[PDB]
Every structure is written in C-alpha cells, then in structure tokens.
Amino acid sequence: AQPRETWGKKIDFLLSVVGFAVDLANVWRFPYLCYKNGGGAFLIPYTLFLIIAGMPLFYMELALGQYNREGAATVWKICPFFKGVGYAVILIALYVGFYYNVIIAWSLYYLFSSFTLNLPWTDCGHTWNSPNCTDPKLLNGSVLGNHTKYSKYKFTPAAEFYERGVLHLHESSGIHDIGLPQWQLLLCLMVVVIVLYFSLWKGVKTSGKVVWITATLPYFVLFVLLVHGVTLPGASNGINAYLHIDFYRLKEATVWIDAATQIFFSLGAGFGVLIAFASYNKFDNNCYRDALLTSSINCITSFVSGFAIFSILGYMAHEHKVNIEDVATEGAGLVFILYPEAISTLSGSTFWAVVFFVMLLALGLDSSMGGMEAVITGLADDFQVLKRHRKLFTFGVTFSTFLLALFCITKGGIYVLTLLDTFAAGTSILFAVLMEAIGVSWFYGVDRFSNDIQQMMGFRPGLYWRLCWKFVSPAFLLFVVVVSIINFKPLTYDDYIFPPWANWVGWGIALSSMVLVPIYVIYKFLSTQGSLWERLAYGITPENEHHLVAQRDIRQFQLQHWLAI
Amino acid sequence: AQPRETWGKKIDFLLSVVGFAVDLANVWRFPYLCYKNGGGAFLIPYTLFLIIAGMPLFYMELALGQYNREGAATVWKICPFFKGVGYAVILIALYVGFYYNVIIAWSLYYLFSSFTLNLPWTDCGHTWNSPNCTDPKLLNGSVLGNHTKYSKYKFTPAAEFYERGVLHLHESSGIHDIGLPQWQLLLCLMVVVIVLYFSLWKGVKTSGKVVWITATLPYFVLFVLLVHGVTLPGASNGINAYLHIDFYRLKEATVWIDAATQIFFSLGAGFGVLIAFASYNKFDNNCYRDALLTSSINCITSFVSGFAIFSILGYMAHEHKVNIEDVATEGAGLVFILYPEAISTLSGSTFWAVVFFVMLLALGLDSSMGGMEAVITGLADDFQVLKRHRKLFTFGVTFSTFLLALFCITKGGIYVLTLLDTFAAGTSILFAVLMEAIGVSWFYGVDRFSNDIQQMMGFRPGLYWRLCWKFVSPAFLLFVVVVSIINFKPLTYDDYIFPPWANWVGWGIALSSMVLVPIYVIYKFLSTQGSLWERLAYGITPENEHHLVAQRDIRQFQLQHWLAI
Ligand SMILES: CN1Cc2c(N)cccc2[C@H](c2ccccc2)C1
Ligand SMILES: CN1Cc2c(N)cccc2[C@H](c2ccccc2)C1
Ligand SMILES: [Cl-]
Ligand SMILES: [Cl-]
Ligand code: NA
Ligand code: NA
C-alpha cells in the first residue's frame, strides 16, 4: 500500500553489505586457517574457489533481490516449491542471532573494564580476573613454561579473566547444568539489544546511517593497529610466517574444502541478508560490480586483519621467547584471551584496548543489524500486517532474541554457543544455499535469470556466470555437504566432551530446517487442487504466470528448459 | 459473525462447573486443614465464610457471564478500566496450566505402573522404586520406627518410589540446577496435552460430552472407596478423629483465615472459567440456583473425600500401630506417597489402585480442560481472529503449555511447581478477585448488576446479596490479601530451603500481574482524547453507553451511585 523503503544512497547499501560480510571470523579464523594450510600457498586454492563461491551466488542473490523485490521468504514466487528455503534462512539468521549477540556482550564487558589505568588482564590479584586455586601466575614476567601450547593455556591471567569472569565456566560443568545467566552479561546483552532496536526501529533509514560509522571505523582501527605492529620487535617473524608459501600442501581435505568453507562462511551468502539488502535498491542499480567490489573488499579486509593478527602473534612469540606456531589461535580465544594479553604489554594499553574493543563491538553489531533486518524484512514481506507495525515487530524480535540468548550467557553458555554456531550455521546454511542454487538454476532456469538481469542492467551475464550457476556452484555446494556429513566429528570443547544428546539436539535442529523446507514443499503440493501434473505445475512455475497452468503450456516439463545453458 | 457456541444442555454446563470446582485440593488439602483447625468445629467458621465466599461472588461471575456474553478479558465493557483484570486471570489460568498438567502426568505414571500383579510401591527391590543407599526398608513388615512423622518419612518404599522415580529429586539439588526433563514424564505430559487438545479442539461441544465421564466417575470412585474403607479395622478411629468438634479453637489466624482461603481456592473463583462457562448459557438460564447447587456439591464432595481419606489414614494408623495425627498429610504426598501405601496393603490392590489413579487423572483433567477453555475463550473474545482459527489457537496454547512445563517435569521440577502454585495462584488470584469485586460493586454499581439480573431472571437479588457484594466480599478479600502479604513466609520445601532469588522471582510474577492490571488502567487512561474528567469518564462508564460521555451525564461522579445499595 506504499512504495518500498528504497535506500537513500547506494553508499549505505554498500557499507551495510560490507559490514555484514566483514565479521569476527575474518579476524580470528581467516589468518589461522590460512597459515595452517600452507601459509601463503593457501591463497591459490582460496581465490579461485572464492571466485565461484563469491561471484555468481552472491550476484544471483543480489540480482534476485533486485528483480524479485521482496524479502527472503516470499522471494520464491517464481517457484513456489522453495519458499520453505526462504523460511529456513530466516530461521538461520535467527539461530545466528541468539549466540552472536553474546559475543558482542563479550566486547562490551572488556570495553567497560578497559576504562581503567590498571587493566585486569595485566597481572594476578583481585582486579576481578577471577583466579583459580591452581597457581595463578604471570605469563613470562616471573616464571617460565615448557612444552605447552600458549593458545589453550588457561593458567595465564588473560586466560583466567575471560573464562572465570565473563563466562563463569568454573561454576558450571557442561550443558547438563547450564546454571543461571550472569547479571553483568545480562546488562550487556540488554544494552546490545537496546541499541539494535534503536538502530532498526525505523527501517533501513536508520541502519544506512549507522553503517557509516559501523562499517568504516574497523578499517581505521586495523590500519592503526598495523602501523603500530609493524614497528615492533619480532612482528616481522610472524609476518613472514604468515605469507610462507608451501606449494607442496596438495592434500585435498586439509586445504581445498577448508578454504571453500572459509570463503562461503565469511562472505555470508545464505542468511537472507543479501536478498533483503538488494530488495531495497533501485531497479536500475548495478549489482554485479557491487557484488564484485564487496567480495574484493571482504577479502582485502580479511587479509589485512590476518596481517595485523600475525604481527601481534610474532610480537608475542618474540616477547615470550616461544615459536610462532604455538601462539597461533582461532576463535574467540584469539580475540579475547591472547590479543588483550599483547595489548597489555605495550605502553598506553588503555587507548589500544579501548579502540580494539570498540572495533570488536562494531564488527559484531553490523552483522547483528544485518541479520535482524533480514529476518524482519522477510517476515514482514511474508505477512504484510507486521510490515505496518514495524516498531512492535522489531521490539518482539529483539526481546525474543534476548530471552532465547539466556542459555548462551549462563555459566555454561559457551557450550550452547558452540553447539548452535557449528550445527545450525554449518548444516542449515549449506542445505539452504544448495536448495537456493538448485531452485534458481534448474527449476526457474539460468536463461530466465539472465533475461531478468538483462532487464535490470543492459549487459547480459556471460557464459561463465551461467555455467557456474547451473553446473559448478551446485556441484561445490553438495560436495561440501557430503564432506561435512561424512567427516562429522562429535562436539568437543578444549577439554570438555559433549554427551551424545547435545550432538543429537544439534542434528535435530539441522534436520528440523532440512524437513521444514520439504515440509513447505509437501504443504504446497497438498494445498493445491487438480491432478498430479496439475498440482506439480503450480509449484515449479512463476506465480504471476500461474494462468499458464490453465492454458497448459509448461516449459519445466520440456527438455529445453533443463538443457538451457 | 455467527451465534455463540451455546451449551447443548445445561447438564453439561453444571458438570463442567462441578468438575472445575472439585479438585485434588478437596481431596488432599480439605481433610487435613479441617482436622488441624479443631476437626469438626472447623465447619462452623467454614460454611458461614463459605456462604459469602461462595454465594455472591460466584453468582456475580455467573451473572456477569450471563449478562456480558463475552470471555474473561472483554467482559469489562461496562467499565473499561478493569479489562486488565480480565487479562491477568487469563494469565492466572495459564500459570496454573504449567504445573497442574504435571500433576496429571504423575497420575498417569502411577496408572501405567499399576498394570502389574506386583506393584512397585509394595516393597523394596529393583521394581523400579529407585532406592537410596540409606537403608531402603519396609514400612512395618520387617522393622519398626520411633519418634518420626509417617507423613514426611522418605525412607519407606512408597515414599522413595514417588520422588526418586517420577521426579528424580535425588539427581537434583534445587532450583539453581533444574537439570533435564524426564522422558517418561515428557511422554506422560504429551499424552495429557494430546487428550486436552482432542477434547478442546472443537469448542465446548466436545467438552460438554467429556465432562459426563470426567465429572461423574470420581464420585462413584469415592463412593466405592468409602464403602470399602468403612469395613476396615481402625478406620473408625480416623473417622472419629476427623469429626472431633473442638469448639475451643477460637484463635483467628489459625482457623478463620485458613478456612476462608480454603473455600476461596477450592471453589475456583478467579480463573475466568466461571465467566467463560456462563458466557455459553442461554440468557434465561437461572445462574443463582446453579451457583448454589455447584457450591453445595463441591462442599459435599470435599466432605466425602475427607471421610474416605481419614478412613484410610485410620486404617494405616491401626495397621502401623501409630497415632492418627502422624499419618495426617496434605498435598501431593498424601495422594501419591501415603494413599498407594495403604492400597498396596489390602488384597486385590491392582483394581483399587487403577480405579484410584483413574479418578486422580479425571480430577486433574477436568480442571485443566476448564482452565484451558477459559483461556482460549477469553483470548478469542479479545481478538476475534483467533476465534475463527480455533484449532490452531488451541494447538498453540497446548504446545506452549507443554514447552513451559518442561521446568516442572525436570529433576527439580517440584520446586518450580511449588513456587508457581503458591506465589502465582495465591497473590494473582487474590488481587484479581479483589479488583473484580471492586469494579463490579463500586464502579459499575450493585444496583446496575441487580437490574441486569432482574432482566436475566424474573426475581431480583435480595438485600443480602448486594450487601455482601459491596461491603462484605471486598473487605474480606482485602483482609485475606493483607494477611497473605504480612504473614508471608520464605519458600521452604520438606527440607530444602529456597534461596532469596526464587522468592523474588515469585513476587516478581505476582507484581507483574498486579502492575499489568494498572498497566492496562494507565493504557486506557492515556489512549483516550479529552480533558482529565473526559478521559476518566471513558473508563468508568459502559462502552455501549459511551455516547453519554458526549451528552455529559455521568452518574459515577454523582454521590447516588456510590451510596447505592
Ligand atoms: C556473515 N556472517 C557470517 C557468519 C557465519 N558464516 C557464521 C556465523 C556467524 C556469521 C556472522 C552472522 C552474524 C549475524 C547473523 C548471521 C551471520 C556474519
Ligand atoms: C478450581 N481450581 C482451584 C485451584 C486452586 N485454587 C489452586 C491451584 C489449582 C486449582 C485448580 C486449577 C486447575 C487448572 C486451572 C486453574 C485452577 C482448580
Ligand atoms: Cl573469507
Ligand atoms: Cl472448599
Ligand atoms: Na561488520
Ligand atoms: Na474436577
């Protein structure tokens, strides 16, 4: 009943997409995974794979969002047998909303604690840094250590602080006894959801202004951190270890599939955020150059974050008289346990720590805003009533996210966080992108998509894009699923071992999504009236062209549609 | 858009109201509380108080439900400043839906376990009766005991079975570590919610047929149990101890307020079930005689259940060579721990146990059906859309009840059950009935209510009913509220002591209801347009007569309305 909330400037759309793509996984996971699989020789399988897993699919979604001007759920009007895939992604970006706002609360506790001349992670004592009875010592200032991994050593002050204070993992023993939510984490999550609501209460009108600071400050932070790190003793060793080209790392499962998963999870394709952001652009906008630029900027950001992180790791290895392979870390530990440990060593640690934690806050906040905006836009385009009462809908979404995140802020919330992240994110987003690629390239057809893009922009996509859409991307989005299913390992923490029922609950969530897609399939199949072929023709044809089912001219049954390149 | 679902026969309405009024509190709580406060001399303060707390208020609600043909929420169109009270009760009957379906799962586990020639509660051994290492012995068959209360002795087989098997309280240590829900209790609760949905999916059309067996079988069960118990050694001692008139029990807080609360909680006024059941009757139905008959039948049922329970207690005291005061018990323990212990002693324990547990199932099932029907009818009359999709609404209500009852079926679910029951039921229903009485007798006026009843039935209520409506029932309710607030004790189990934060959460739920009523008050005050008096006149006048605010003729501001008797 009103024109759609088009972006005021395309710069806002670009900044939003970049802030969604750039994530903490580019900071903590990209450098370690790059150094593990041959160092610099990790880039050769990366970019090529990146190209596929980065260029068509993203473009496709963008093009989809540009052509089918709707949310993630109701974007499948061209093929009604895949709207469940539009539902699952909305649930996906919801499951990634429960635990990823707890990681933002972790960057706010550290920010509040950094407003002190003496940082708690510097040394031992009752600056909170809740200590264990088992010899809370100094890293290297007073006593040394031998034959131990500095990454997982939990007896340093910067490693005791994080766990014991923020997570209170000592008070818990596993997911069987989660305990009670931390009141400090509760207040941090309240502040997080409050700023999320205040940034997403009035639509993309506010988010396009917030992404100006949220998507540009981390770049300046990383630049200043690199400038400071390059002028540090021992950082050159870590930098040389980072870009150490080992071309003899030809093992497939170790390098290739890992790089593919890294690119696919870093770029963010499969949460509905891309379709939601592209549904707010003008019909004449060029989404091809936008997708290419966003992918290149994401890769450059990951590369410079890896440079900074490995310079810090080399500085730590030189200052602690240890090798660089030991300080190599990935995950929340590298950004919360090990990086503040290095920040505390340099002079003026307050400014560096405050800036680093504000950057960490912004990186998570942009991705959370993108995910919540995608969910809200999808559920509003699915049911138009919620589109009118956007304030109450956003408030309800944020409150449900806050209430369902209490299990991730409790004494044993890190276990639930890891379970949700791994199982939900991996399996759900893999199945979702596989179904999306199949539906767009086989049921709707690559020829129709190319014609839609030609209607959008004057230039038609080349043969390479269609070949990657139809035969390459669906082949590299099913191989990864088979590898993840076959090479699945039981859920394991640093030392804690998850009982079988936790893994069964994770696989139950995965299967819930992967049946909810066929649940909507069979729902659309049964909710129709007619014969078998008549029912099948109302789910593989465009809805706006459903009258063609009455005229009985269906091309999906024809061989030319399946053989169209 | 359609005629309301009027009851097919008034017999169905009577059976539904009787099955809602008759509850497990009449079975386990009424006899013990009657014997405690002077025995038979407990009846003299009872009935008189009963009369007030039984006759007008109930009648009022019924009359209200007969005049204002709507649910519990939207019954305050005569005074829009009290619809929040119609909301709170819907929440009340919801908070009593979470834990009271777990008590029904407790009567289904015992029913399934009773389908065996050798009952597990008869003796010790690995017939499940999960035993503790601390000397699992026989009650009196092998060894004796001295200076111990048989009610709370948890080392008998019938006392170890209930806790360790059904609740698994040994695996828990309090509300701080609730644990995981029991899969057997999970299946029992699934069966319970399934039969509740299948009985309430098509409205009162099915419930009126279900109450035929649900509200009449417990009476035959109690009759057969009395006939069996009177012909038992030592039952005469317990029967004489039951009706032992001690007229010197003149202490007020011990007898009077306890009997008042007993009547008020046993009759069920304050859950919205009465208004919901009266909104489905014909406009010419006589709700006065119906209310009187239902109250009298409830009292007679409580009396005969007390007779049967105390005959069983006397039999146990004679068979165990102990006094009758020791076996006196109230709550779930008397019906689950002590009564099956007596059933196992007699020959043919299988039939008696099966019949007793089917009666226990029906007693809880009728009350749960009444509460859920009240909630559904209220929320459907509040929002008419949910009235059309009644199947999906009932399914969602039952599923939310099942999901929010997992905290009451876990290893420490009995603590959450007691917390919810005590705090929510007591405080919320007290404040709700107080606000209802005040709004009906002071804002709407007893004269208007009497005129509405005269329009309903030919006879106008006498002066006694109006005097009890205006000055006696509200004052008695306020006195009970003040006593409950002042004489409040910290939450305590048999031996476990609740931490302060559990009591704070209970009082937080209580205060949530007792602000949600003023929340709707201030919402209606602010959502109006006009001056102060103009805004106030749109919340204390009938909605259908709101045009009188334009004509500026308001009687609530006049003194004749407040002085009307
Ligand atoms: C782009 N995203 C990638 C990703 C992956 N692959 C796994 C877990 C979290 C995330 C981040 C995210 C934040 C909020 C909602 C959805 C996703 C960013
Ligand atoms: C009449 N009711 C009285 C009562 C009280 N006073 C306290 C707790 C439970 C109950 C029972 C009930 C069952 C389901 C919904 C609401 C109430 C029956
Ligand atoms: Cl990446
Ligand atoms: Cl009673
Ligand atoms: Na970002
Ligand atoms: Na009943």
Inter-residue contact A525 to A535 (CB < 8 Å)? yes
**β partners of residue A492:** A497
B289 domain residue, yes or no: yes
> How many Å apart are CA B41 and CA B260, to the nearest integer?
14
> How many Å apart are CA A316 and CA A328, to the nearest integer?
10
**A19 CA distance to ligand 5 centroid (A)?**
3
Q: What is the CA radius of gyration of chain A?
A: 24
Q: Six-digit token pair at A448?
A: 């129709």
CA–CA distances in Å: residue A499 to residues A173, A427, A490, B412: 12, 20, 9, 21
- In terms of Cα–Cα distance, which of B166, B156, B127, B125 is closest to B342? B156
> How many Å apart are CA A185 and CA A467, to the nearest integer?
49
How many distinct structural domains can be found in chain A? Answer: 1
SS3 of A278, please?
helix
Residue written as token pair 């209970």 = B506
**B361 CA distance to ligand 6 centroid (A)?**
9
Residue A271 in contact with ligand 1 by CB distance below 6 A: yes
Task: Check whether A279 is labelled as a binding-site residue.
Answer: no
SS3 of B96, please?
helix
B536 domain residue, yes or no: no
Q: How many CA atoms lie within 13 A of A145 on its CB side?
A: 18
Closest chain A residue to B502 measured between Cα atoms? A180
Residue B94 in contact with ligand 2 by CB distance below 6 A: no
Inter-residue contact B539 to B423 (CB < 8 Å)? no
Q: Using alpha carbons only, give the angle B210, B216, B221 rounded to the nearest 5 degrees.
A: 125
Q: Across the A/B interface, how many CB contacts are shorter than 8 Å?
A: 7
**B267 CA distance to ligand 2 centroid (A)?**
9
Say if the Cβ atoms of B176 and A180 lie within 8 Å: yes
Amino acid at B204: V
Q: Six-digit token pair at B39?
A: 């025995």
CA quadruple A446, A451, A454, A460: dihedral sign: positive
A44 domain residue, yes or no: yes
Alpha helices of B383-445 — where are they, by DSSP H? Answer: 384-388, 390-403, 413-419, 429-438
> How many Å apart are CA B175 and CA B195, to the nearest integer?
30
CA A128 to chain centre: 32
> How many Å apart are CA A271 and CA A16, to the nearest integer?
14
Buried b (16+ CB within 10 A) or exposed e, B292-314: bebbebbbebbbbbbbbbbbbbb
Resolution, Å (one decimal): 3.1
A563 domain residue, yes or no: no
How many helices (H) and strands (E) chain A has is answered by 31, 0
- In terms of Cα–Cα distance, which of B296, B273, B285 is closest to B204? B273
- DSSP, res A497: B
- DSSP, res A136: -
> How many Å apart are CA A281 and CA A14, to the nearest integer?
11
B543 domain residue, yes or no: no
Whose alpha carbon is nearest atom 9 of ligand 2? B96
Interface test with chain A among B173, B176, B177, by most A beta carbons within 10 Å: B177
Q: How many CA atoms lie within 13 A of B182 on its CB side?
A: 25
> How many Å apart are CA B288 and CA B458, to the nearest integer?
12
Q: What φ, ψ does residue A528 adopt, rounded to 5°?
A: -100, 165
Look at chain A and count its residues: 565
Whole domain around residue B242: which residue ranges? Answer: 10-527
Q: Six-digit token pair at B423?
A: 């705090």
Task: Check whether A330 is labelled as a binding-site residue.
Answer: yes
Inter-residue contact B50 to B296 (CB < 8 Å)? no
> How many Å apart are CA A518 and CA A505, to the nearest integer?
20
Residue A107 in contact with ligand 1 by CB distance below 6 A: no
Q: Give the DSSP H/E element, type plus range, for residue B119.
A: none
Inter-residue contact A217 to A358 (CB < 8 Å)? yes
Residue A26 in contact with ligand 1 by CB distance below 6 A: no
In order, the DSSP letters of B270-312 are TSSHHHHHHTTS-TT--HHHHHHHHHHHHHHHHHHHHHHHHHH
Residue written as token pair 């009118």 = A388
B532 domain residue, yes or no: no
B2 domain residue, yes or no: no
A89, A367, A433, best to mutate for ligand 1 pocket (most atoms within 8 Å of CB): A367
- DSSP, res B248: T
In order, the DSSP letters of B29-88 are THHHHHHHTTGGGGHHHHHHHHHHHHTHHHHHHHHHHHHS-S-SGGG-TT-GGGHHHHHH
Helix, strand, coil tally for chain A in percent (to 5): 70, 0, 30
Which residues have CB atoms below 5 A from the ion given as ligand 5?
Answer: A 19, 22, 363, 366
What method was applied to determine this entry?
cryo-EM
Inter-residue contact A22 to A16 (CB < 8 Å)? no
Say if the Cβ atoms of B179 and A180 lie within 8 Å: no
CATH of the domain at A389: 1.20.1740
**A490 CA distance to ligand 5 centroid (A)?**
31
In order, the DSSP letters of B479-496 are HHHHHHHHT----B-SS-
Inter-residue contact B312 to B229 (CB < 8 Å)? yes
SS3 of A156, please?
coil
A291 domain residue, yes or no: yes
In order, the DSSP letters of A183-235 are HHHHHHHHHHHHHHHHHHSSTHHHHHHHHHHHTTHHHHHHHHHHHHHHSSTTH
Distance from CA of B273 to the nearest CA of A (A): 29
Q: What φ, ψ does residue B122 adopt, rounded to 5°?
A: -70, -50
